[PDB]
CSV table of C-alpha atoms and ligand atoms in Angstrom, one decimal:
chain,number,residue,atom,x,y,z
R,1020,UNK,CA,-192.1,-69.3,-61.8
R,1021,UNK,CA,-189.6,-72.1,-60.8
R,1022,UNK,CA,-188.7,-72.9,-57.2
R,1023,UNK,CA,-185.3,-71.3,-57.7
R,1024,UNK,CA,-187.0,-68.1,-59.1
R,1025,UNK,CA,-189.3,-68.1,-56.1
R,1026,UNK,CA,-186.4,-68.2,-53.7
R,1027,UNK,CA,-184.6,-65.5,-55.6
R,1028,UNK,CA,-187.8,-63.4,-55.5
R,1029,UNK,CA,-188.0,-63.8,-51.7
R,1030,UNK,CA,-184.3,-62.8,-51.4
R,1031,UNK,CA,-185.0,-59.8,-53.5
R,1032,UNK,CA,-188.0,-58.8,-51.5
R,1033,UNK,CA,-186.1,-58.7,-48.2
R,1034,UNK,CA,-183.0,-56.9,-49.8
R,1035,UNK,CA,-185.0,-53.8,-50.8
R,1036,UNK,CA,-183.2,-53.6,-54.2
R,1037,UNK,CA,-183.5,-55.1,-57.7
R,1038,UNK,CA,-181.7,-58.4,-58.4
R,1039,UNK,CA,-180.8,-59.9,-61.7
R,1040,UNK,CA,-179.5,-63.5,-62.1
R,1041,UNK,CA,-178.5,-65.7,-65.1
R,1042,UNK,CA,-177.0,-69.1,-64.8
R,1043,UNK,CA,-175.8,-71.3,-67.6
R,1044,UNK,CA,-175.1,-74.9,-66.6
R,1045,UNK,CA,-172.8,-76.3,-69.3
R,1046,UNK,CA,-173.5,-79.9,-68.2
R,1047,UNK,CA,-176.8,-79.6,-70.1
R,1048,UNK,CA,-176.5,-76.2,-71.8
R,1049,UNK,CA,-179.6,-74.9,-69.9
R,1050,UNK,CA,-180.2,-71.5,-68.3
R,1051,UNK,CA,-181.9,-70.2,-65.1
R,1052,UNK,CA,-182.9,-66.5,-65.2
R,1053,UNK,CA,-184.3,-64.0,-62.7
R,1054,UNK,CA,-185.0,-60.6,-64.3
R,1055,UNK,CA,-182.9,-62.0,-67.1
R,1056,UNK,CA,-184.0,-59.6,-69.7
R,1057,UNK,CA,-184.0,-56.4,-67.6
R,1058,UNK,CA,-181.1,-54.0,-68.0
R,1059,UNK,CA,-178.6,-53.4,-65.1
R,1060,UNK,CA,-175.6,-51.1,-64.9
R,1061,UNK,CA,-172.5,-53.3,-65.4
R,1062,UNK,CA,-170.1,-51.1,-63.5
R,1063,UNK,CA,-166.6,-52.7,-63.5
R,1064,UNK,CA,-167.9,-56.1,-64.7
R,1065,UNK,CA,-167.5,-54.4,-68.1
R,1066,UNK,CA,-163.7,-54.8,-67.8
R,1067,UNK,CA,-164.0,-58.4,-68.9
R,1068,UNK,CA,-165.3,-57.3,-72.3
R,1069,UNK,CA,-162.5,-54.7,-72.7
R,1070,UNK,CA,-159.8,-57.2,-71.7
R,1071,UNK,CA,-161.3,-59.8,-74.0
R,1072,UNK,CA,-161.3,-57.4,-76.9
R,1073,UNK,CA,-157.6,-56.7,-76.5
R,1074,UNK,CA,-157.0,-60.4,-76.3
R,1075,UNK,CA,-158.8,-60.8,-79.6
R,1076,UNK,CA,-156.6,-58.1,-81.1
R,1077,UNK,CA,-153.6,-60.0,-79.8
R,1078,UNK,CA,-154.5,-63.0,-82.0
R,1079,UNK,CA,-153.2,-61.2,-85.0
R,1080,UNK,CA,-150.4,-59.2,-83.2
R,1081,UNK,CA,-148.0,-61.5,-81.3
R,1082,UNK,CA,-146.3,-58.6,-79.6
R,1083,UNK,CA,-149.4,-56.7,-78.6
R,1084,UNK,CA,-149.6,-57.7,-75.0
R,1085,UNK,CA,-146.0,-56.6,-74.6
R,1086,UNK,CA,-146.7,-53.2,-76.1
R,1087,UNK,CA,-146.0,-50.3,-73.6
R,1088,UNK,CA,-148.5,-47.7,-72.8
R,1089,UNK,CA,-147.6,-44.4,-71.2
R,1090,UNK,CA,-149.1,-43.6,-67.8
R,1091,UNK,CA,-149.2,-39.8,-67.1
R,1092,UNK,CA,-150.2,-38.0,-63.9
R,1093,UNK,CA,-153.4,-36.8,-65.6
R,1094,UNK,CA,-154.4,-40.5,-66.3
R,1095,UNK,CA,-155.0,-41.3,-62.7
R,1096,UNK,CA,-158.7,-41.4,-61.7
R,1097,UNK,CA,-160.5,-42.5,-58.5
R,1098,UNK,CA,-159.1,-46.0,-58.0
R,1099,UNK,CA,-155.7,-46.8,-59.5
R,1100,UNK,CA,-153.7,-49.0,-57.2
R,1101,UNK,CA,-151.5,-50.4,-59.9
R,1102,UNK,CA,-151.3,-47.6,-62.4
R,1103,UNK,CA,-150.2,-45.0,-59.8
R,1104,UNK,CA,-146.9,-46.9,-59.3
R,1105,UNK,CA,-146.2,-46.4,-63.0
R,1106,UNK,CA,-147.0,-42.7,-63.5
R,1107,UNK,CA,-144.4,-41.0,-65.7
R,1108,UNK,CA,-143.6,-44.6,-66.8
R,1109,UNK,CA,-145.3,-47.3,-68.8
R,1110,UNK,CA,-147.3,-50.5,-68.4
R,1111,UNK,CA,-147.8,-53.2,-71.1
R,1112,UNK,CA,-151.2,-54.2,-72.4
R,1113,UNK,CA,-150.8,-57.5,-70.4
R,1114,UNK,CA,-150.1,-55.5,-67.2
R,1115,UNK,CA,-153.0,-53.2,-67.9
R,1116,UNK,CA,-155.3,-56.2,-68.5
R,1117,UNK,CA,-154.2,-57.9,-65.3
R,1118,UNK,CA,-154.6,-54.7,-63.3
R,1119,UNK,CA,-158.0,-54.0,-64.7
R,1120,UNK,CA,-159.3,-57.5,-64.0
R,1121,UNK,CA,-157.6,-58.6,-60.9
R,1122,UNK,CA,-157.4,-55.3,-59.0
R,1123,UNK,CA,-160.2,-53.4,-60.8
R,1124,UNK,CA,-157.8,-50.6,-61.6
R,1125,UNK,CA,-159.8,-47.9,-63.4
R,1126,UNK,CA,-156.8,-46.2,-65.1
R,1127,UNK,CA,-155.9,-49.6,-66.5
R,1128,UNK,CA,-159.5,-50.0,-67.8
R,1129,UNK,CA,-159.3,-46.6,-69.5
R,1130,UNK,CA,-156.1,-47.7,-71.3
R,1131,UNK,CA,-157.8,-50.8,-72.6
R,1132,UNK,CA,-160.7,-48.7,-73.8
R,1133,UNK,CA,-158.3,-46.3,-75.5
R,1134,UNK,CA,-156.6,-49.2,-77.2
R,1135,UNK,CA,-160.0,-50.2,-78.7
R,1136,UNK,CA,-160.7,-46.6,-79.9
R,1137,UNK,CA,-163.1,-45.6,-77.2
R,1138,UNK,CA,-166.2,-47.1,-75.4
R,1139,UNK,CA,-167.8,-47.9,-78.7
R,1140,UNK,CA,-164.9,-50.1,-79.6
R,1141,UNK,CA,-165.7,-52.3,-76.7
R,1142,UNK,CA,-169.4,-52.4,-77.9
R,1143,UNK,CA,-168.2,-53.3,-81.4
R,1144,UNK,CA,-166.3,-56.3,-80.0
R,1145,UNK,CA,-169.4,-57.4,-78.1
R,1146,UNK,CA,-171.4,-57.3,-81.4
R,1147,UNK,CA,-168.7,-59.2,-83.2
R,1148,UNK,CA,-169.0,-62.1,-80.8
R,1149,UNK,CA,-172.8,-62.1,-81.0
R,1150,UNK,CA,-173.8,-60.0,-78.0
R,1151,UNK,CA,-176.4,-57.5,-79.3
R,1152,UNK,CA,-177.3,-56.3,-75.8
R,1153,UNK,CA,-174.1,-55.1,-74.1
R,1154,UNK,CA,-173.2,-51.4,-74.5
R,1155,UNK,CA,-170.3,-49.4,-73.2
R,1156,UNK,CA,-170.8,-45.7,-73.5
R,1157,UNK,CA,-168.4,-44.1,-71.0
R,1158,UNK,CA,-164.9,-44.4,-69.6
R,1159,UNK,CA,-164.2,-45.0,-65.9
R,1160,UNK,CA,-165.2,-43.9,-63.4
R,1161,UNK,CA,-168.4,-42.4,-64.9
R,1162,UNK,CA,-169.5,-45.7,-66.4
R,1163,UNK,CA,-170.3,-46.6,-62.7
R,1164,UNK,CA,-172.9,-43.8,-62.1
R,1165,UNK,CA,-175.6,-46.6,-62.2
R,1166,UNK,CA,-178.6,-44.2,-62.4
R,1167,UNK,CA,-181.9,-46.1,-62.4
R,1168,UNK,CA,-183.4,-46.1,-65.9
R,1169,UNK,CA,-180.2,-44.9,-67.6
R,1170,UNK,CA,-179.4,-47.3,-70.6
R,1171,UNK,CA,-175.7,-46.3,-70.7
R,1172,UNK,CA,-173.2,-48.9,-69.7
R,1173,UNK,CA,-175.8,-51.6,-69.2
R,1174,UNK,CA,-176.5,-55.2,-70.2
R,1175,UNK,CA,-179.0,-57.9,-69.3
R,1176,UNK,CA,-178.1,-61.0,-67.1
R,1177,UNK,CA,-179.1,-63.3,-70.0
R,1178,UNK,CA,-176.7,-61.6,-72.4
R,1179,UNK,CA,-173.8,-61.3,-70.1
R,1180,UNK,CA,-174.0,-65.0,-69.1
R,1181,UNK,CA,-174.0,-66.1,-72.7
R,1182,UNK,CA,-171.1,-63.8,-73.6
R,1183,UNK,CA,-169.0,-64.8,-70.5
R,1184,UNK,CA,-169.6,-68.5,-71.5
R,1185,UNK,CA,-168.4,-67.9,-75.1
R,1186,UNK,CA,-165.3,-66.0,-73.8
R,1187,UNK,CA,-164.2,-68.4,-71.1
R,1188,UNK,CA,-165.5,-71.8,-72.1
R,1189,UNK,CA,-166.4,-71.4,-75.8
R,1190,UNK,CA,-164.5,-70.3,-78.9
R,1191,UNK,CA,-164.9,-66.5,-78.9
R,1192,UNK,CA,-161.2,-66.3,-78.3
R,1193,UNK,CA,-158.3,-68.4,-79.5
R,1194,UNK,CA,-157.2,-71.2,-77.2
R,1195,UNK,CA,-154.1,-69.3,-75.8
R,1196,UNK,CA,-156.2,-66.2,-75.2
R,1197,UNK,CA,-159.1,-68.1,-73.6
R,1198,UNK,CA,-156.6,-69.7,-71.2
R,1199,UNK,CA,-155.1,-66.3,-70.4
R,1200,UNK,CA,-158.5,-64.8,-69.7
R,1201,UNK,CA,-159.4,-67.7,-67.4
R,1202,UNK,CA,-156.1,-67.4,-65.6
R,1203,UNK,CA,-156.7,-63.7,-65.0
R,1204,UNK,CA,-160.3,-64.2,-63.7
R,1205,UNK,CA,-159.1,-67.0,-61.4
R,1206,UNK,CA,-156.5,-64.6,-59.9
R,1207,UNK,CA,-159.1,-61.9,-59.0
R,1208,UNK,CA,-158.5,-60.3,-55.7
R,1209,UNK,CA,-161.8,-58.7,-55.1
R,1210,UNK,CA,-164.4,-61.5,-55.2
R,1211,UNK,CA,-164.4,-63.5,-52.0
R,1212,UNK,CA,-167.4,-61.8,-50.5
R,1213,UNK,CA,-169.6,-62.0,-53.6
R,1214,UNK,CA,-170.6,-65.1,-55.7
R,1215,UNK,CA,-167.6,-67.0,-54.1
R,1216,UNK,CA,-169.1,-66.6,-50.6
R,1217,UNK,CA,-172.3,-68.4,-51.5
R,1218,UNK,CA,-170.6,-71.5,-53.0
R,1219,UNK,CA,-169.1,-74.5,-51.3
R,1220,UNK,CA,-165.4,-74.0,-50.6
R,1221,UNK,CA,-164.4,-76.9,-52.8
R,1222,UNK,CA,-165.7,-75.2,-56.0
R,1223,UNK,CA,-163.3,-73.0,-57.9
R,1224,UNK,CA,-164.3,-69.6,-59.1
R,1225,UNK,CA,-162.9,-67.0,-61.5
R,1226,UNK,CA,-164.9,-63.7,-61.4
R,1227,UNK,CA,-165.0,-60.0,-61.9
R,1228,UNK,CA,-166.9,-57.7,-59.5
R,1229,UNK,CA,-168.3,-54.3,-60.0
R,1230,UNK,CA,-169.9,-51.6,-57.9
R,1231,UNK,CA,-171.2,-48.1,-58.3
R,1232,UNK,CA,-173.6,-45.6,-57.1
R,1233,UNK,CA,-177.1,-46.7,-56.1
R,1234,UNK,CA,-175.5,-49.3,-54.0
R,1235,UNK,CA,-174.8,-51.3,-57.2
R,1236,UNK,CA,-173.1,-54.5,-56.4
R,1237,UNK,CA,-172.3,-57.0,-59.2
R,1238,UNK,CA,-170.3,-60.1,-59.9
R,1239,UNK,CA,-169.9,-62.3,-63.0
R,1240,UNK,CA,-168.2,-65.7,-62.6
R,1241,UNK,CA,-167.1,-68.9,-64.3
R,1242,UNK,CA,-167.4,-71.7,-61.7
R,1243,UNK,CA,-166.0,-75.2,-61.7
R,1244,UNK,CA,-168.1,-77.1,-59.1
R,1245,UNK,CA,-166.7,-80.1,-57.4
R,1246,UNK,CA,-167.6,-83.0,-59.7
R,1247,UNK,CA,-169.8,-81.0,-62.1
R,1248,UNK,CA,-169.3,-79.4,-65.5
R,1249,UNK,CA,-168.6,-75.7,-65.4
R,1250,UNK,CA,-171.2,-73.0,-64.7
R,1251,UNK,CA,-171.4,-69.4,-65.7
R,1252,UNK,CA,-173.2,-67.1,-63.2
R,1253,UNK,CA,-174.1,-63.4,-63.4
R,1254,UNK,CA,-175.5,-61.6,-60.3
R,1255,UNK,CA,-176.5,-58.0,-60.6
R,1256,UNK,CA,-177.9,-55.9,-57.8
R,1257,UNK,CA,-178.9,-52.2,-57.5
R,1258,UNK,CA,-180.8,-50.1,-55.1
R,1259,UNK,CA,-183.2,-47.1,-55.1
R,1260,UNK,CA,-181.1,-44.4,-53.4
R,1261,UNK,CA,-177.8,-43.0,-54.7
R,1262,UNK,CA,-176.0,-43.4,-51.5
R,1263,UNK,CA,-177.0,-46.9,-50.7
R,1264,UNK,CA,-174.4,-49.3,-49.2
R,1265,UNK,CA,-172.8,-52.3,-51.1
R,1266,UNK,CA,-174.6,-55.6,-50.5
R,1267,UNK,CA,-172.2,-58.3,-51.6
R,1268,UNK,CA,-174.0,-60.6,-49.2
R,1269,UNK,CA,-177.1,-60.5,-51.5
R,1270,UNK,CA,-174.9,-61.8,-54.4
R,1271,UNK,CA,-173.6,-64.5,-52.1
R,1272,UNK,CA,-177.2,-65.4,-51.1
R,1273,UNK,CA,-178.2,-65.6,-54.8
R,1274,UNK,CA,-175.3,-67.8,-55.6
R,1275,UNK,CA,-176.2,-70.1,-52.6
R,1276,UNK,CA,-179.8,-70.4,-53.9
R,1277,UNK,CA,-178.5,-71.3,-57.4
R,1278,UNK,CA,-176.0,-73.9,-56.1
R,1279,UNK,CA,-178.7,-75.5,-53.9
R,1280,UNK,CA,-181.0,-75.6,-56.9
R,1281,UNK,CA,-178.7,-77.6,-59.2
X,2230,K,K1,-171.5,-47.5,-53.9
């Protein structure tokens, strides 16, 4: 047990929930893990994998991101701030990717999933890029039920950090596509209370949040510290009762501990 792990354990003890953390520091290609091999519900952090899979498809179809997708009234689900403006109209796969990532639009996510042939298409892409842990089993919003012990729509912090590094900093995607994914993540609207809140202001962050039942509060980020090589950081948090409140502050505190421990 390292000093950073001891701090994270103390944070977890006082939070009342279960915390999972994985850091990869690309300066030295080392990792720091807390419950790194335990499974957690991804919730909407899974949208990164779906968007990335569509970006991969776009490497062999120049026009794919411009392809229109029909949005029908029946397509709207529980949280659709972008798609609802386009009902009885269309959105392109680029628009759907941006809406899913930057606004966490669930209708947009479902269109990405459908473009990949269902949740198992997202899992297939994960396997193709070397992630044997990730699984997507359901569409939105049911992928966010986050029931303790349920393997559906889960990954581990270790696996997710490794994948997010490959996607954003490594060569899982082509150069154009990697840059597009990074642009999207950096433009996220939903992240300032989560990992971002625990880091010095000068550091730049691209991230995707998630949340679900059981007070599940997640964030996965690529971080460009001031004067340091990039980091990838996953923070997952889930609680024992179905109706628990979100705890984005716990993610911020985990990020703060990680930053202080570099
Ligand atoms: K909740």
